[PDB]
Amino acid sequence: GIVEQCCTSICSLYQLENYCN
Amino acid sequence: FVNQHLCGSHLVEALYLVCGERGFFYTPKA
């Protein structure tokens, strides 16, 4: 999930936008 | 800003700024 991709590892804009509505 | 380790309120604020009026969903326990 998002915590694995952005918190435990380095986040990116590409990944963050996967969670916008 | 975006390219770093973002956790908790720090991650939530990034989603807020990036998604804008589109909104977003936060699911820690995916």
From Swiss-Prot, chain A:
Disulfide bonds join C6-C11. It comes from the Eukaryota. This is Insulin A chain. It comes from Sus scrofa. The chain holds residues 88 to 108 of 108 of the full protein.
